[PDB]
Point group: D2
Chain length 142, copies 4
Amino acid sequence: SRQTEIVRRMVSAFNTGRTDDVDEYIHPDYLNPATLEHGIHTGPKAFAQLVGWVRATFSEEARLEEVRIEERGPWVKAYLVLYGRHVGRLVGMPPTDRRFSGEQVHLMRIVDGKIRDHRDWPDFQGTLRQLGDPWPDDEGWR
Amino acid sequence: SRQTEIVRRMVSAFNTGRTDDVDEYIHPDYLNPATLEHGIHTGPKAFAQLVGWVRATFSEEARLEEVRIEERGPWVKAYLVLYGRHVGRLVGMPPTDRRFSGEQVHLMRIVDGKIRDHRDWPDFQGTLRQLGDPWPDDEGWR
Amino acid sequence: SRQTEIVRRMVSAFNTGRTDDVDEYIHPDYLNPATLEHGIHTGPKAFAQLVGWVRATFSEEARLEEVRIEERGPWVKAYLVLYGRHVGRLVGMPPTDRRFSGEQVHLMRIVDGKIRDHRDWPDFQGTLRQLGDPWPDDEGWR
Amino acid sequence: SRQTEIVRRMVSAFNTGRTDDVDEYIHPDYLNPATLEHGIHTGPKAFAQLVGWVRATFSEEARLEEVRIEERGPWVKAYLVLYGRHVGRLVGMPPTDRRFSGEQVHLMRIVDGKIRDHRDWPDFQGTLRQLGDPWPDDEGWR
Ligand SMILES: COC(=O)C1=C(C)CC(=O)c2c1cc1c(c2O)C(=O)c2c(O)cccc2C1=O
Ligand SMILES: COC(=O)C1=C(C)CC(=O)c2c1cc1c(c2O)C(=O)c2c(O)cccc2C1=O
Ligand SMILES: COC(=O)C1=C(C)CC(=O)c2c1cc1c(c2O)C(=O)c2c(O)cccc2C1=O
Ligand SMILES: COC(=O)C1=C(C)CC(=O)c2c1cc1c(c2O)C(=O)c2c(O)cccc2C1=O
């Protein structure tokens, strides 16, 4: 139950935008490999930046709802659903202003009480469908 | 565009619960083959009953959002997303009170200005996941 | 484990087309509510007809693979994946001859050793995408 | 049609494992941001390494089937379906030896006749379900 509660605190940060206490539950060595192309590198600051990015992209009304959280050893798996609105540029695609919802799975390793390894799997295909199958502009993503 | 607007009127009925005017856009011969196991048979009354059932099952806050509507001949295809809350018994499963969202596709044939043939394809599997993989009780569905 | 094995026998019938022994594991009162619009009514014969329809529609190479089977009381839930090819008319849509695969969930009630209540939830939306978003012809489905 | 054919050549490489000619259709500056955590960096060699990784992970029988390919300007969008078998370690998860299939969307920018920007969106959640919801081992992914 300790580990489930740590992951619920991470979920809560995405829902409130609250990053002042991330050093209490994000490991110094935190890395989410998806964040690198944004410039977002390691530790509590990287996680704070990721929260910021999610809210900037999918709006201050984004909601991550919990379906269920599982654990095995030091690993925690969170089955969530994201509810958002496409209000920020996303992989080179201007904001469609379209609402969407999609299931997501997160996998996290807890190391000495804090989240150190974090992978997430959005329902990218369903999000793109709900956004009307957007395209990047000439600027693109790189 | 006429046919797209008829289907938008159907979508709107699910969003408002408004069934007083269904005879203006639902064909006398309307049939949705999924409705039969509820007792819901043909024409405008069957469609009214279906609206009622959707709102009773997925709540008076259910929302059907439009992604896109396509047509070919007398056929219209609606790409929607349902947002709801499981507040009514569903295929023998007591209400979980869980929020969910899922894409849905509807296919309708327009006959003399009114919806006559109607099939819908919910994201049943994703809904069930978001409801925590519920089970029917001893009463079941039949 | 008895009930899991009964459902595996049902899965096997779809994979082999073998219907000579359906009276041994399909209840006299069997009903799948989806089958009614094809004319397919109750008991072992209805189930045999459904096997036939699946193979006629999604080809003699259709394969239903097992992910996992769960039970609770008299209920069994089968998480499967269908692999097929669209070789028969489907809801008024001529055969695209396209290969597809989609997860499916089946829910069955076992009554005195035999399958009596059967609901299935195909990934209809994903199947339709993989078939290139087909349309019904003028004949339609009714 | 030129750009569609370039993307079909990329699809074909995943299906045959053929990487001797990647410099003819992969830009010197090619980057897929997902590949970085494997060590796989830029250009034709990075793409060759990615083909290798896909076949090592999802087997020499992996098949990427084409649903449809769209283009807009220099951008190409490929709607595919992957058929594979989990035979290599995947994000810290030992091979389950389970077959799976999942839709995938790829987005590519063509620059002077060659693929330069490449993002892919697997159906990760559906793959994980079909693999029986595997877990990483103690070694993990990092
Ligand atoms: C609640 O957070 C996320 O959903 C998320 C996180 C934590 C980190 C990420 O890097 C992404 C997303 C979500 C997301 C995408 C992320 O990179 C993305 O690229 C993405 C995309 O490229 C196209 C459609 C939807 C997307 C997403 O929902
Ligand atoms: C907005 O309407 C629907 O979603 C809908 C309609 C119009 C008619 C129907 O018969 C069903 C649904 C939705 C629906 C189910 C319907 O029969 C259903 O059985 C169903 C289910 O059995 C399990 C999970 C979700 C479900 C649904 O979202
Ligand atoms: C392995 O069996 C099935 O997939 C199945 C069964 C047992 C009974 C059924 O009535 C249907 C399907 C599958 C199916 C559809 C069934 O009615 C269907 O209408 C259907 C559809 O209308 C559009 C796309 C895919 C479909 C399916 O895969
Ligand atoms: C045909 O190629 C791919 O599917 C693919 C490619 C080109 C590049 C990639 O980096 C990934 C995948 C597929 C893939 C994953 C990739 O990174 C992955 O991490 C992945 C995963 O982490 C869990 C389940 C399925 C997965 C995949 O199908």
